[PDB]
Design a protein around this ligand. Structure first.
Ligand SMILES: CCCCCCCCCCCCCCCCCC(=O)OC[C@H](COP(=O)([O-])OCC[N+](C)(C)C)OC(=O)CCCCCCCCCCCCCCCCC
Ligand SMILES: CCCCCCCCCCCCCCCCCC(=O)OC[C@H](COP(=O)([O-])OCC[N+](C)(C)C)OC(=O)CCCCCCCCCCCCCCCCC
Ligand SMILES: CC(C)CCC[C@@H](C)[C@H]1CC[C@H]2[C@@H]3CC=C4C[C@@H](OC(=O)CCC(=O)O)CC[C@]4(C)[C@H]3CC[C@]12C
Ligand SMILES: CC(C)CCC[C@@H](C)[C@H]1CC[C@H]2[C@@H]3CC=C4C[C@@H](OC(=O)CCC(=O)O)CC[C@]4(C)[C@H]3CC[C@]12C
Ligand SMILES: CC(C)CCC[C@@H](C)[C@H]1CC[C@H]2[C@@H]3CC=C4C[C@@H](OC(=O)CCC(=O)O)CC[C@]4(C)[C@H]3CC[C@]12C
Ligand SMILES: CC(C)CCC[C@@H](C)[C@H]1CC[C@H]2[C@@H]3CC=C4C[C@@H](OC(=O)CCC(=O)O)CC[C@]4(C)[C@H]3CC[C@]12C
Ligand SMILES: CC(C)CCC[C@@H](C)[C@H]1CC[C@H]2[C@@H]3CC=C4C[C@@H](OC(=O)CCC(=O)O)CC[C@]4(C)[C@H]3CC[C@]12C
Ligand SMILES: CC(C)CCC[C@@H](C)[C@H]1CC[C@H]2[C@@H]3CC=C4C[C@@H](OC(=O)CCC(=O)O)CC[C@]4(C)[C@H]3CC[C@]12C
Ligand SMILES: *[C@@H]1O[C@H](CO)[C@@H](O[C@@H]2O[C@H](CO)[C@@H](O)[C@H](O)[C@H]2NC(C)=O)[C@H](O)[C@H]1NC(C)=O
Ligand SMILES: *[C@@H]1O[C@H](CO)[C@@H](O[C@@H]2O[C@H](CO)[C@@H](O)[C@H](O)[C@H]2NC(C)=O)[C@H](O)[C@H]1NC(C)=O
Ligand SMILES: CC(C)CCC[C@@H](C)[C@H]1CC[C@H]2[C@@H]3CC=C4C[C@@H](O)CC[C@]4(C)[C@H]3CC[C@]12C
Ligand SMILES: CC(C)CCC[C@@H](C)[C@H]1CC[C@H]2[C@@H]3CC=C4C[C@@H](O)CC[C@]4(C)[C@H]3CC[C@]12C
Lengths: 515, 515
């Protein structure tokens, strides 16, 4: 087991290398599959869009101190490094909502306190490098031992729902921007974007999304059907999302007059606001002399950023490397943590955003490399090339502007809805949420359906709904940086509060290590 | 069996009455079900829309000699009479494409020959009354004996596909009328209809259609699922189309500014062009003296109209009253023919259109009254009230303008696509069309799948595709009135040409009386 404390300094880190690095020739050769390319194409669009979206939000929020150009380069470099050196290469390292919320907060703080933001982040980075080295030394990734199914399901479900809400909210904004009016203006300026409302924009975006999600779900049904020969059915099934994108990007292309929002990458590989910084950020300061109180006080925001990245990344590794998912090579919690957080700290010196192993992408990436027979899982295509290629392509996104500039965001939203829905598959919580509606006669005949009474099973599912609700309120409120700390409290709940009200026999079956 | 020649004058007609009329108290009381109301609501919109659409086409094609007001009254009166007196009340008596094509042709003829069209049709009616009485006397509905599965499947499949094509063609016309343009005019006049193109009209029509068809198909899946209690799941399942219409009619209502095409009934119960006729049509003439050569020569167009109505109605009765479908009361081919054609002839005297037992509606009506368990059919809800209520409501459609004027045609198209798709269910031809794509290992294990070799089964399916193609070309070409005569040639094909190239053992299994 990786979670056993070796008792020797960097004992986990050594064992995590000695576990996976023998299977490195396999990690390159296991990628020799069309399913692995079909994964790259899908997970590239999954990786790029947030690097464009969050990068755009970063720019307008931080006065272009950090923007799309920075985040595209960071996502690419860290993704390439992690793909090659990671103990679990199926982890997709990218920027997230919690990380955006911090960059917002640290900027807002730096403006009020009159500090260089981009220089301020360099010291957040130096602490993260010191703090991860200190944690990996003493084998602090052994505390991922204590994070049970209970916590993993609540998280995986919360992050999957947030993703679906975020996807739908982006569609609503198009209808809010381009409402269904009786009359419009046709002297409107599209200098940076449609200055005023346009006809046919919002309904076409709705159709483009719906059509993309439809074809994606139908081509998944087709994959696990008894139509057409097995090879052709599998090949077309494996390229479910790539076909769904191609079909509906072509639908958009042949519609001439009507406007849709397209993927807009930067002009070239340039810093977002040269008037505010270069590439390499000087710790002692750029314009004004950087003060000494912040150089030590940076530890507190660095400890917060560490928790955000640790919780998200380590829980993503648990969910991806579950026993039920046929992962033979095995994940290394020490090596993965050392890279993700370590690289993030080094990235801050170059004024680029630190990243995390994002759940929906990592989950989706693993799912894109999972084979199906008869239905159950035979084996997952465990390799470093899919994660590498996605990172390299995100880096090259600036150069391949002509290809991306024709692809609408409407199509991408249909793929995010598919990602959001598909990510719920192997969550026992979601499986038990469906049993609340199903009568007890037509239950799946699994242990917690058999061993535990129907009202006891639904009560346990009831506690996880109450957690998700609290987690969703904490996400909504200004205190959104405290969601990792609220997520941690699910471990006490399972270990202290549940065994009081629930019997152990029920909990062992409901919350099991294997299915 | 109803198809046995009694050998006594009106022997079939008597036996058809003596079969069903004992079960008349059941025909009233079997309707006491919410499924039967859910059938009325669905089949009312199925019955009304063509009575509006064909009625509108009749008006512009015949200079309002026959219009919507006429067809709404005819569909209502004949539907009410047939519902009460019919041997198979599940037959929905309405106007069809083949009947429109004749009214076109007879008008075009009457203009060239300088004859009173509406007066000319009165003599077509008098012959139909004489010709049906002559056929029913000598038991000519015994020739429906010779119409096998082969012919019934080709027809049922052709009429189902034409319906789907007609539904999609109506959507294309909206995009052709209201294209996706960059700029529009907003001094456009909507006096009788949008004089020029509008924004958001066509894409909303597409969404409204797609949404209606989606919910309809999902609520059918829900009906035959293991989610929510059995009664609630069945009730909501039974009201699948009524809910699907309500949801998407409300979506249209809350969209204020954007225009959609709505159901437009006439102002009141008035003749379409009083300047050209009254209610009762004088056989000897209205304006000019009606000639004697046409009074005898009317037999030829009356013989053509008879074949059109006979083939369509008698084949619809076969398809509806199959052994597979649990129809205990039994259909009467003599009584049903005597009413449909007889009423049509009497209707012509009042300058109203003669009708036929339309397949998709009749099939859909039977399907709307069919229960499902475990899945197989237990029993069909055989009653006269569903057919009666649909006819009465079509009659009242003129009075309930406020309710219909809010319902868009876009929603109705989603229900026609559902009708078109659902009508293919119990067609062995369609079942065998799917086996062309499926590998032979995953075949349904039914007699023709086992007894007959895979390439022989697919060859037989190949002959029926070639028939459908020829039937579709005959439908497209100017000679569309000859489609009944081309459909009749499938009976020789099965009886003469197939037993030459196919063995009897194969044909008996492929073309079986029961499944
Ligand atoms: C697997 C099957 C394929 C997927 C299903 C696709 C079927 C087709 C559905 C079509 C969409 C129908 C609903 C939208 C109706 C039109 C909206 C509109 O015009 O409103 C404008 C309104 C305008 O709001 P307003 O009214 O406040 O604007 C006022 C403005 N003035 C005053 C100027 C007029 O905008 C919206 O908010 C519309 C949002 C649309 C939301 C619909 C999302 C549908 C996407 C697919 C859903 C997926 C289902 C998941 C379940 C299955 C999971 C496995
Ligand atoms: C149970 C399934 C749930 C429902 C599935 C459907 C999901 C939702 C899909 C949304 C529609 C996406 C496809 C259309 C793309 C947009 C069209 C457009 O804007 O083009 C304009 C074009 C413009 O063409 P044009 O030729 O006028 O363009 C020339 C331009 N001018 C005039 C300026 C010179 O118009 C069309 O022709 C589009 C018509 C719509 C296409 C048909 C839609 C089908 C919807 C139902 C399908 C159901 C699935 C059946 C299979 C399953 C059966 C069980
Ligand atoms: C922040 C950036 C610069 C990354 C910093 C990573 C270092 C903390 C790593 C990189 C290589 C590591 C070393 C790689 C190999 C070993 C041998 C290892 O030997 C054993 O005792 C292993 C025996 C076994 O259990 O098999 C002891 C730790 C050590 C020195 C490691 C200590 C931690 C090091 C220096
Ligand atoms: C590395 C392979 C696998 C391709 C995938 C990633 C590359 C497309 C990216 C990763 C980081 C990028 C680099 C990040 C920073 C810079 C500095 C940038 O600035 C300069 O040196 C020019 C002068 C100036 O701006 O001051 C020029 C582009 C370059 C080399 C970028 C070019 C594109 C790179 C190599
Ligand atoms: C919407 C707000 C209140 C956010 C909080 C989340 C709710 C959706 C939670 C709060 C309490 C939960 C309930 C607490 C206890 C139960 C009993 C539990 O088992 C039963 O006693 C009924 C089932 C059976 O008898 O088999 C079923 C779920 C349910 C209703 C839970 C469903 C989800 C609820 C309503
Ligand atoms: C002419 C218009 C108004 C349409 C009506 C068609 C007529 C030609 C039908 C309507 C009622 C029919 C009659 C209904 C009942 C009978 C009794 C029937 O009596 C028997 O021979 C016994 C039947 C048996 O026991 O089998 C003979 C046919 C007859 C006169 C039928 C002959 C054909 C009739 C007149
Ligand atoms: C009562 C229900 C169950 C019957 C079925 C539906 C009704 C709403 C329809 C069926 C036929 C319709 C009738 C068909 C023809 C006429 C003649 C029409 O005559 C006139 O224009 C006025 C008198 C004249 O000027 O000659 C008046 C409406 C009326 C009675 C219609 C009223 C509505 C009726 C009864
Ligand atoms: C639409 C236009 C082109 C009108 C013509 C109709 C075609 C669609 C028909 C004409 C001949 C038909 C084919 C003739 C023979 C066969 C082989 C038959 O299978 C076999 O006999 C061998 C395959 C096996 O081993 O099962 C399957 C149907 C098919 C393709 C037929 C169905 C489709 C075809 C091309
Ligand atoms: C690019 O950076 C410049 C500074 O390098 C930004 O200018 C600042 O603007 C804010 C308010 O918008 C002021 O509070 C600062 O005093 C300005 N700084 C200086 C010295 O100019 C500018 O906002 C940035 N623009 C972009 C691209 O976002
Ligand atoms: C109603 O019917 C009248 C009678 O045919 C139509 O009026 C005729 O119009 C045509 C040209 O369309 C002329 O050639 C005739 O001289 C007109 N006849 C009479 C007596 O008016 C009228 O077009 C029809 N209108 C409707 C409602 O379709
Ligand atoms: C750019 C956007 C709009 C769409 C991009 C999707 C592209 C890359 C996808 C869509 C369909 C895909 C193809 C689908 C099937 C196969 C067969 C397989 O044996 C080799 C790869 C190949 C030939 C795929 C290559 C990549 C492909 C062309
Ligand atoms: C007019 C158009 C837009 C929509 C018309 C559909 C109406 C008539 C339909 C939609 C949903 C239907 C209801 C659905 C379920 C039930 C429960 C059943 O036990 C009694 C009938 C009742 C209460 C139905 C009555 C008719 C109903 C209200």
């Amino acid at each position: 087991d990786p979670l056993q404390q070796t008792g020797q300094l960097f004992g986990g880190l050594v064992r995590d290398i000695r576990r996976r690095y023998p299977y490195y020739l396999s990690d390159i050769t296991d990628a020799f599959s069309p399913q692995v390319l079909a994964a790259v194409i899908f997970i590239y669009f999954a990786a790029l869009s947030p690097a464009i979206t969050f990068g755009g939000l970063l720019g307008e929020k931080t006065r272009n101190q950090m923007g799309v150009s920075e985040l595209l380069i960071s996502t690419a470099v860290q993704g390439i490094l992690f793909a090659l050196l990671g103990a679990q290469p199926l982890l997709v390292v990218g920027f997230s909502g919690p990380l955006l919320v911090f960059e917002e907060a640290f900027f807002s703080f730096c403006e009020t306190n009159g500090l260089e933001y981009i220089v301020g982040r360099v010291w957040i980075g130096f602490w993260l490098i010191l703090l991860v080295v200190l944690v990996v030394a003493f084998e602090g990734s052994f505390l991922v031992r204590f994070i049970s199914r209970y916590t993993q399901e609540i998280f995986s479900f919360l992050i999957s729902l947030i993703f679906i809400y975020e996807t739908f909210s982006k569609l609503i904004k198009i209808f809010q921007d381009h409402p269904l009016q009786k009359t419009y203006n046709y002297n409107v300026l599209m200098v940076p974007k449609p200055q005023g409302p346009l006809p046919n924009t919002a309904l076409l975006s709705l159709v483009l999304m719906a059509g993309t999600f439809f074809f994606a779900m139908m081509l998944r049904k087709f994959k696990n059907s008894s139509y057409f020969p097995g090879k052709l059915r599998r090949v077309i099934g494996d390229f479910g999302v790539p076909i769904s994108i191609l079909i509906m990007v072509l639908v958009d292309f042949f519609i001439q007059d009507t406007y849709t929002q397209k993927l807009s990458v930067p002009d070239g590989f340039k810093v977002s606001n040269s008037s505010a910084r270069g590439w390499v950020i000087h710790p002692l300061g750029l314009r004004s002399e950087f003060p000494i109180w912040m150089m030590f006080a940076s530890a507190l925001p660095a400890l917060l950023v560490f928790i955000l990245i640790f919780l998200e990344s380590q829980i993503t590794t648990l969910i991806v490397s579950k026993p039920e998912r046929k992962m033979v090579k095995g994940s290394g919690f020490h090596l993965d943590l050392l890279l993700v957080v370590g690289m993030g700290g080094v990235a801050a010196l170059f004024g680029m955003p630190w990243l995390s192993a994002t759940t929906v992408r990592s989950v989706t990436h693993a799912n894109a490399l999972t084979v199906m027979g008869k239905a159950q899982i035979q084996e997952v295509k465990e390799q470093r090339i899919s994660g590498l290629l996605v990172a390299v392509l995100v880096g090259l996104s600036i150069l391949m502007e002509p290809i991306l500039s024709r692809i609408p965001l409407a199509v991408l939203f249909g793929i995010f809805l598919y990602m959001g829905v598909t990510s719920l598959s192997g969550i026992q919580l979601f499986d038990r949420i469906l049993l609340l509606f199903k009568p007890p006669k037509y239950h799946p005949d699994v242990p917690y359906v058999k061993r535990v009474k129907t009202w006891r099973m639904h009560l346990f599912t009831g506690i996880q709904i109450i957690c998700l609700a609290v987690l969703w309120v904490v996400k909504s409120t200004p205190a959104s940086l405290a969601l990792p700390f609220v997520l941690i409290l699910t471990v006490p709940l399972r270990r202290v509060l549940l065994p009081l009200i629930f019997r152990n026999v029920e909990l062992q079956c409901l919350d099991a290590d294997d299915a």
